[PDB]
Amino acid sequence: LWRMGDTIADETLLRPHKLSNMDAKAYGPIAKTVLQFKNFVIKSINGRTMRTFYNATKNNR
Amino acid sequence: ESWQVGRDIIDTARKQLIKANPWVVNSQLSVVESIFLQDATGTIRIRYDKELVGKLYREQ
């Protein structure tokens, strides 16, 4: 049971990059929350501050 | 001194794109350099060029 849950969740939610690659019948109460948090992260990385910091020193930790 | 038409076209296009689509407000619609109109998440992407703009302007 645990293996099934983990595999399905990982493959469906975390693998496909880009927002035009997601296909799904319907979404539940936690799928929306995960998607919106991921959207927040993706917005954060594309900014100017993070790009300048990474260019100056190649420190991703 | 004809660089004063592309400026107006770009401004008008940006205003229309913001007006017609009601989820861009939280995003940051920008202009990178061809010329692209991009989104914060990188989903909306449009391209512009000299020749088509000139031809359409002349015809109009």
**Using the beta-carbon criterion (under 8 Å), do A20 and B41 form an inter-chain contact?**
no
Secondary structure of chain A as H, E, C letters: CHHHHHHHHHHHHHCCCCHHHCCCCCCCCCHHHHHHHHHHHHHHHCCHHHHHHHHHCCCCC
Listed residue (B10, B7, B5) closest to B36, CA to CA: B10
CA angle B37, B39, B40 (to 5 degrees): 145
Listed residue (A33, A38, A13) closest to A23, CA to CA: A13
Structural resolution in Å: 3.3
Interface test with A, best of B23, B41, B44, B45 (most A CBs within 10 A): B41
* Resolved by: cryo-EM
Query: Which residues in chain A are closer than 8 Å to B27, comparing Cβ atoms?
Result: 43
Chain A to chain B Cβ contacts (< 8 Å): 11
Beta carbons of B33 and B44 less than 8 angstroms apart: no
CA angle A4, A24, A7 (to 5 degrees): 15
CA distances from A45 to A17, A40, A51, B24 (A): 14, 9, 8, 18
Query: Which residues in chain A are closer than 8 Å to B41, comparing Cβ atoms?
Result: 19, 39, 42-43, 46
d(CA B26, CA B23): 7
CA distances from B48 to A30, B13, B21, B29, B56 (A): 40, 11, 20, 16, 13
Longest dimension (CA), chain B: 37
d(CA A40, CA A10): 19
Beta carbons of B18 and B37 less than 8 angstroms apart: no
Tokens for A38, please give them.
């991921």
Cα of A53 vs its chain's centroid, Å: 21
